[PDB]
Curated annotation (Swiss-Prot), chain B:
Name of protein: Kelch repeat and BTB domain-containing protein 2
Assembly mode: Component of the BCR(KBTBD2) E3 ubiquitin ligase complex, at least composed of CUL3, KBTBD2 and RBX1. Interacts (via the BTB domain) with CUL3.
GO cellular-component term (any): cytoplasm
Pathway: Protein modification; protein ubiquitination
Keyword Phosphoprotein in record: yes
Domain BACK as annotated: residue spans: 127-223
SMART domains in alphabetical order: BACK, BTB, Kelch
Amino acid sequence: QINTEYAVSLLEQLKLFYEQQLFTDIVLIVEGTEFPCHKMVLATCSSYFRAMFMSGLSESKQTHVHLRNVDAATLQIIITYAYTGNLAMNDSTVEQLYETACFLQVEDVLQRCREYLIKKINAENCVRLLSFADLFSCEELKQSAKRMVEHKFTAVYHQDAFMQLSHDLLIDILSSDNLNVEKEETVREAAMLWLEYNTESRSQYLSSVLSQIRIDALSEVTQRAWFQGLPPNDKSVVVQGLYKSMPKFFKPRLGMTKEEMMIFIEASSENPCSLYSSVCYSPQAEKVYKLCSPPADLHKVGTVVTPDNDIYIAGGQVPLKQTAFRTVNCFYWFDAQQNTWFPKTPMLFVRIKPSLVCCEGYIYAIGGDSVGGELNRRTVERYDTEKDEWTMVSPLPCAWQWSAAVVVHDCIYVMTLNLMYCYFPRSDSWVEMAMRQTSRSFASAAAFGDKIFYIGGLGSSVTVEIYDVNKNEWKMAANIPAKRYSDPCVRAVVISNSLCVFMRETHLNERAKYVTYQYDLELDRWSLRQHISERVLWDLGRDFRCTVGKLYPSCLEESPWKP
Amino acid sequence: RQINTEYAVSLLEQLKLFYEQQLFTDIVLIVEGTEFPCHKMVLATCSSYFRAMFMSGLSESKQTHVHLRNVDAATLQIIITYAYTGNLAMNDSTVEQLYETACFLQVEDVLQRCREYLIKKINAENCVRLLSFADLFSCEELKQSAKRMVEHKFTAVYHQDAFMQLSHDLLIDILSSDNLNVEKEETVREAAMLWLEYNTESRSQYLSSVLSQIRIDALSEVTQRAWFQGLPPNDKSVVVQGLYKSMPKFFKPRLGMTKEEMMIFIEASSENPCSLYSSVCYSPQAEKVYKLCSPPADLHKVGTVVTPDNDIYIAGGQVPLKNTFRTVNCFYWFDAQQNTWFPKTPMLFVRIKPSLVCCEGYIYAIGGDSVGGELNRRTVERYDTEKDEWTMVSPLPCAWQWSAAVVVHDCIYVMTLNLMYCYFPRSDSWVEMAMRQTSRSFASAAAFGDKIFYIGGLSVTVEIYDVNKNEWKMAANIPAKRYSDPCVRAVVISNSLCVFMRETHLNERAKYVTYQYDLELDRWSLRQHISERVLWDLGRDFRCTVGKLYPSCLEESPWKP
């Protein structure tokens, strides 16, 4: 191999020459700023300077080149990267950095900024990044922007930059089958408002934008509104659209295929070659669709589903390369369509079984057997979904183990064996709450409306303690009627605007039975909503978690397994 | 920060590619008609002369073609390719010209690399040549190393052709130094004379200077008559100046005369509990116990060998892994004056307690757990003291453990439990020899005269073998106290066969005593009893070998009687 010591010595000597200006022969003249540099470094880094000097043109012998349509700071950072390899990339100058990299055709900085932008893609810059990837040919960025823009924009459709988009880009966006919309009318009104941004600059594109939307809205309202905005005496558009909506037979999209499903993680692996797996139950389809494995079989993790219906994974441990397990603070995000886990910004401290709770767009991970264990062994930390970073919050006053947390009334409610503390995001403080009369642990709670339903606790039992936020008191309702001499595995969840329970029971010398019940809020009784047949759902285990979310049956595949 | 992962390797490789394609070049070097297009930046960053060649404002700074002379084409090409790729790939022949060109071009890195290569390759013959080379081009490290090597070897050769052509200052430094490894004072006198006989009437003043340098002890023997035979005619004041060098200039004894025949011991009972083993020495005549520095200071289970030129070598050994005994094939050599250990070319197999045998100037390592898992478990490997390399030879006939090997009549002899094979260096083959009637192991043999004396084994078995007769016979039993396990050590002392044995009983202290053995008497006469007031306990795995050492360079071992 090439001697790295001599390579770094040569590089540092060249950078010293650059700083001291000894062997510089070519100077870059940009907006009156002198940039003394060498030809060898520029040729090695950029693919434009190699065609600027070794070309035989008038600049081959000229020692002063007036490089135009560039920026001084961008050129300076590119030159210093070419001379030392350090590329300091902030969150603002990456746009002009990519512009100058494309202008100068430098592959290394182009790849680096492409990776930075593939990491930086978020909701508030999705349309801007897609427009940037349309301006400069970049297929990876274009595809990532396609996916993220489709999802987040069809969720939001309010960005100001969406109005200033090319016709081809909008045709690609609207005609795609990856849009995430609960209805087919929101895309219609989004297209209408985009068209009405201008009057005559969009008339020619009117015949094309309607060609990608289904005819179910091409004969109903929002056709006379276009006639109102039609240019005067234009008889080539009204009669055109009058007899035009014959083709494009109505085909349902993919965004209207989200159903309230119970996502399960760390289920019992069917094949003994793997430790655990992830499955999902369909309360409506009455089937069990398989889910992608956790990233690097990440066990002992926590789940959260934001009001925007997004799944996240935090904490967990990976078997170190017989008992062998090491805890890692890696963070991941689940793609609802690609059926894969996209990595995100990792946490600061590793966790085991963390309680992920979403509130005000922030992901809160409370506790989880942190590595530190100092006097603040109860330190909790939130995540920024806008800036893609983690921020510490007010620590929990008391150290708790095997706890659960929910969000009610824009506040974080973490529950332990007998104590409860409410966190105020506005003031970053903890307030003492009501005290339970029973010592129970290893249970889960579901936030339904303005009440907290702590179900089960210790196997578990059928004890239920209902807490009211407005009343600040713990009261008993009833006990779930289950078979005696059994060990039910209770799982509290909210579904169909009602509090249902996923309770798996096992009898003596008998296999586990799956059945869910609907708890009557006013009657204080668990009614049999549906019985899960064992012909579709097999054993899941004991350390499995359940959460409420929506998934697409089309993108996912049915799990092939014998009843 | 110098990021070595992406840019450094890529930048260096692209610069090399640009050099290959003759791209972006602006300076070309003319060397006796050969053209070397290159770049100014690489020459500036590598050589400390090209930076002044292209930066200092003169007529050659703005000069597309430069005619650089007094430089070899191949050396400049290899320097340029080293600057463009970082790899030197130096041979053993073009080192002198490469170093000369590096010194002319002031390229510090390649200068240091060549200095290390030259200081590692002062083997046997280029010592005076590279000493003169270092005198021409000032190099303190090379100068000192070559001076020590010359003081060690030229004092035994003093006939090298290159030694005749030396500058006066270097010769004065060599001769006036008190590091001459000569047991007699006339050899240096005749060396100086022969250095002043081939070049006479040209260095007459330097002749007088060297005459004064050699001093009275050798000046009063023959030099006057030889000079009278060889003096130029009509020289009178030269007689006056030569007659003056009889009384003055501090006649003092030399250092090479102190070649006392002693015994080098390894793996002794360390005094400080922090250390495990130590290497010490014993003086048969001075009746003193000297110490030596451990070669690795941490590795043990080494083997010793002594060449006829009184040199000490250490090969193989095992060292603890120091995790939070691994075998190492390293090699070392003991300095007779610096009391240190300079490493040499390592072996190819990690041996445990190798048996090194010297013959025909070559070091032969026989057995000693080569790798253990060999397809042919019975193999050997020798050493070249001149070429400094390891050469594979014909393997062992049979696989043996705890064996011993000696050299007799320029022939390799290895002894095992009951078998013995003679290895012919000329034909590189093993010939079957006589078989012992007694099966004894864990013993060593001594090569005294033309007879091999295999002593001990499990005892006091004295089996004498003769090469000319090819037979094994018994002589007697060494007188040792009963209820004891003697530790026998057979070695040559002052051209007389003697033994060094220690007896240990129950609830009794060890006693050290050496006896004088006679060939025709078959008796070990009491020669000298080693008093415990000067020598302490050694141990069980200690080894003994015969060699000459310097008392002044070494240090006495402090121990309470």
